[PDB]
């Protein structure tokens, strides 16, 4: 999920946009 | 790209997502 990929690891803005509706 | 946690994560999702919102 988002915490594992973006908080624990690092995610690009392209991977973050995956969590938008 | 750095670690984005808690409140900073939601603010970054606010700006990336805009009007779409986030699931």
UniProtKB/Swiss-Prot annotation, chain A:
Cysteine pairings via disulfide bonds: 6-11
Coiled-coil region: none
Superkingdom assignment: Eukaryota
Name of this protein: Insulin A chain
